[PDB]
Amino acid sequence: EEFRPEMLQGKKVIVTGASKGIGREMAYHLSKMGAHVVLTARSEEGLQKVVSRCLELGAASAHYIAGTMEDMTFAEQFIVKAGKLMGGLDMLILNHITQTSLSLFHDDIHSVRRVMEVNFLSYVVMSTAALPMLKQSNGSIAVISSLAGKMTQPMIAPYSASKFALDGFFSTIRTELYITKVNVSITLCVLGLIDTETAMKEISGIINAQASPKEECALEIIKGTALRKSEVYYDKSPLTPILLGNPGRKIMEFFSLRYYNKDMF
Amino acid sequence: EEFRPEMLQGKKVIVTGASKGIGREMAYHLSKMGAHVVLTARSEEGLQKVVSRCLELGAASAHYIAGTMEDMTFAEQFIVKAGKLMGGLDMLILNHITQTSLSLFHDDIHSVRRVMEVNFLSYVVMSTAALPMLKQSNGSIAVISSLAGKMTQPMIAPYSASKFALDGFFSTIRTELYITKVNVSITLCVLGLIDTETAMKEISGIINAQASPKEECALEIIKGTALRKSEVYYDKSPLTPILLGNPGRKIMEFFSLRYYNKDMF
Numbered sequence: 001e002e003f004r005p006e007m008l009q010g011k012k013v014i015v016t017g018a019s020k021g022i023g024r025e026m027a028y029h030l031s032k033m034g035a036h037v038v039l040t041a042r043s044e045e046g047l048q049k050v051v052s053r054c055l056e057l058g059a060a061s062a063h064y065i066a067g068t069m070e071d072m073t074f075a076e077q078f079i080v081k082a083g084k085l086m087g088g089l090d091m092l093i094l095n096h097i098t099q100t101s102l103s104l105f106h107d108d109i110h111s112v113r114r115v116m117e118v119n120f121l122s123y124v125v126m127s128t129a130a131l132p133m134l135k136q137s138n139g140s141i142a143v144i145s146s147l148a149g150k151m152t153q154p155m156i157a158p159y160s161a162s163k164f165a166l167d168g169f170f171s172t173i174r175t176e177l178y179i180t181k182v183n184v185s186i187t188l189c190v191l192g193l194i195d196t197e198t199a200m201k202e203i204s205g206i207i208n209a210q211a212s213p214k215e216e217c218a219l220e221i222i223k224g225t226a227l228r229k230s231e232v233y234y235d236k237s238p239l240t241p242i243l244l245g246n247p248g249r250k251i252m253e254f255f256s257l258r259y260y261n262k263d264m265f
Numbered sequence: 266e267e268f269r270p271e272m273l274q275g276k277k278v279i280v281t282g283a284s285k286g287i288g289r290e291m292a293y294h295l296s297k298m299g300a301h302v303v304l305t306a307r308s309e310e311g312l313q314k315v316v317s318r319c320l321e322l323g324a325a326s327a328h329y330i331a332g333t334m335e336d337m338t339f340a341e342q343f344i345v346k347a348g349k350l351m352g353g354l355d356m357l358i359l360n361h362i363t364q365t366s367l368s369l370f371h372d373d374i375h376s377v378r379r380v381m382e383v384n385f386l387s388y389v390v391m392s393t394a395a396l397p398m399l400k401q402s403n404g405s406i407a408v409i410s411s412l413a414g415k416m417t418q419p420m421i422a423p424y425s426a427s428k429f430a431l432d433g434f435f436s437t438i439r440t441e442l443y444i445t446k447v448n449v450s451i452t453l454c455v456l457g458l459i460d461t462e463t464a465m466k467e468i469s470g471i472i473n474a475q476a477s478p479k480e481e482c483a484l485e486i487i488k489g490t491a492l493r494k495s496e497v498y499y500d501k502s503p504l505t506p507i508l509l510g511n512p513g514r515k516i517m518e519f520f521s522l523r524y525y526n527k528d529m530f
């Protein structure tokens with residue numbers, strides 16, 4: 001079947017890194033469709049600007065809770081507060097990411113440990129906190145990733161690690177949910193270069209490549225999650241999903257189940 | 266190019282998780298090849314019993330330094346101590362891992378963090394500590410991964426995560442090294458089920474899969490690192506390398522380079 005903006009109307013949705021990037025654009029879209037939405041980021045002032053434009057756009061609800069996702073406590077406690085305000089949860093969109101910049105890795109061990117904590121750990125934390133409600137509503141999670149999470153590119157080793165980490169963790173959780181017959185879907189969103197302020201300013205002078213619209217990307221992330229697709233590739237080239245779709249892995253993932261004890265499920 | 270045990274005579278090698286399993290096996294193989302070797306794990310008594318057999322096997326040299334790789338400080342300090350102990354480094358073999366069990370992910374958030382620290386973080390730490398020596402030696406690094414580091418199967422999400430993290434990071438370091446003309450190689454070893462005791466113990470009552478012999482596996486890991494191959498797949502099936510090999514990714518990666526500003530490296 002196809003997508004209809006009426007599919008998200010009245011649905012309670014959580015969006016991280018909603019302050020400015022494509023995450024912010026995602027809020028605006030959820031609003032125009034009329035959905036309850038609690039955002040989050042670090043900039044309290046910024047979450048404000050957006051939360052109000054959400055009501056305007058037509059959001060059934062719109063709240064914000066400031067904090068850093070570098071603190072696993074605030075992350076788990078964010079999903080709980082958020083859920084309370086909406087009286088349930090329908091969609092969890094893990095989008096935020098700690099700051100990263102193009103650079104040949106040298107020895108920033110602490111910068112790495114942070115990238116993992118914020119880009120990966122916090123996701124696994126909130127996803128856990130949100131699962132119980134997500135199970136109630138037969139919801140779905142959208143974990144935002146990059147092409148660099150399916151493949152390798154120089155100057156972003158730590159960032160890439162976290163995004164690969166994501167694929168490996170959630171891809172497992174996804175099938176682990178499916179074999180246990182729990183109707184909560186996981187959608188890994190594989191994005192190409194995007195119009196956002198952060199990306200453009202950070203690749204300036206280092207990488208010259210065409211970027212795609214911060215708003216269209218956002219609509220696609222939402223549509224795909226709503227349609228409950230496993231993966232969503234959004235990029236300039238129609239070859240990406242084919243070159244990175246890894247059919248071989250799909251085959252092996254399939255065969256491997258053959259050796260498990262069905263009882264254990 | 267064809268392998269020949271001579272390629273390791275007089276080579277200084279570090280091997281983690283040498284206390285048992287594939288680690289201990291790689292030690293023994295390095296010894297028969299007359300190489301200088303320093304091993305690590307946590308069990309002192311365990312390292313002792315194996316550091317002896319190594320000598321008896323014909324090792325040019327053999328010493329041990331016990332400690333937990335959960336300690337980022339002990340990790341980095343382990344490489345320096347091990348380097349002074351052998352007066353240089355030729356090959357770094359990152360193999361150790363933290364205790365892991367097959368269970369559907371629930372909410373073990375602290376376990377996840379542990380697995381990332383020991384299985385992934387300590388690796389970037391030791392590879393960063395050891396790089397300067399590896400650069401002088403024009404040596405190489407061997408990162409032991411699993412099929413679950415290229416694909417996904419239920420009941421090993423955190424493990425699978427850290428493994429994906431390794432591929433994302435070292436694949437990026439590898440290409441970064443080549444792009445900046447540094448003759449240090451990175452070999453990612455994609456291993457299938459292997460007959461070690463912790464593997465057979467852990468899959469008992471859950472998985473049917475046939476295992477492969479630890480010594481043949483260990484040898485092939487060495488052969489590949491020595492021949493400086495990017496990736497090495499060792500599995501009972503000849504189909505695995507063509508299924509998990511993911512050529513489309515290699516294609517993307519190549520073209521990806523042609524978008525950078527060549528004067529950055």
Ligand SMILES: NC(=O)C1=CN([C@@H]2O[C@H](COP(=O)(O)OP(=O)(O)OC[C@H]3O[C@@H](n4cnc5c(N)ncnc54)[C@H](OP(=O)(O)O)[C@@H]3O)[C@@H](O)[C@H]2O)C=CC1
Nearest residue numbers: 017019020021022042043068069095146191194196198199
């Ligand atoms: N734009 C692109 O070209 C591409 C982006 N992506 C992915 O898309 C997603 C969004 O990226 P994008 O919108 O461009 O990035 P932005 O940097 O523009 O947005 C990041 C968001 O995360 C928030 N954030 C940053 N640090 C923290 C923190 N420590 N704790 C909590 N929130 C934080 C920021 O708010 P604040 O700083 O105010 O806290 C902002 O709201 C990411 O997951 C990224 O990997 C993938 C491919 C391409």
Ligand SMILES: NC(=O)C1=CN([C@@H]2O[C@H](COP(=O)(O)OP(=O)(O)OC[C@H]3O[C@@H](n4cnc5c(N)ncnc54)[C@H](OP(=O)(O)O)[C@@H]3O)[C@@H](O)[C@H]2O)C=CC1
Nearest residue numbers: 282284285286287306307308333334411456458459461463
């Ligand atoms: N066997 C298999 O089927 C396969 C294994 N692999 C990979 O092969 C490698 C070896 O696995 P395998 O030999 O079977 O595993 P084992 O459990 O048999 O060996 C693990 C080694 O790591 C050491 N270790 C454990 N905990 C710590 C710690 N906290 N700090 C430092 N060292 C530690 C152990 O010694 P100690 O506890 O005394 O410190 C031991 O010598 C790993 O990278 C694994 O992921 C991949 C595919 C298949």
Ligand SMILES: C[C@]12C[C@H](O)[C@H]3[C@@H](CCC4=CC(=O)CC[C@@]43C)[C@@H]1CC[C@@H]2C(=O)CO
Nearest residue numbers: 100101146147148159192193198199202203
């Ligand atoms: C990682 C970033 C987003 C995204 O990941 C970018 C990367 C720059 C290189 C690059 C080229 C692509 O065609 C895929 C996206 C990507 C790999 C970007 C640099 C900083 C930026 C941010 O940190 C968030 O926007």
Ligand SMILES: C[C@]12C[C@H](O)[C@H]3[C@@H](CCC4=CC(=O)CC[C@@]43C)[C@@H]1CC[C@@H]2C(=O)CO
Nearest residue numbers: 365411412413424457458463464467468474
């Ligand atoms: C991860 C382990 C090794 C290896 O990774 C195993 C995994 C069990 C599932 C599995 C089946 C395979 O056909 C590929 C190897 C693998 C994915 C194993 C469980 C415990 C064991 C250890 O902890 C180290 O040996």
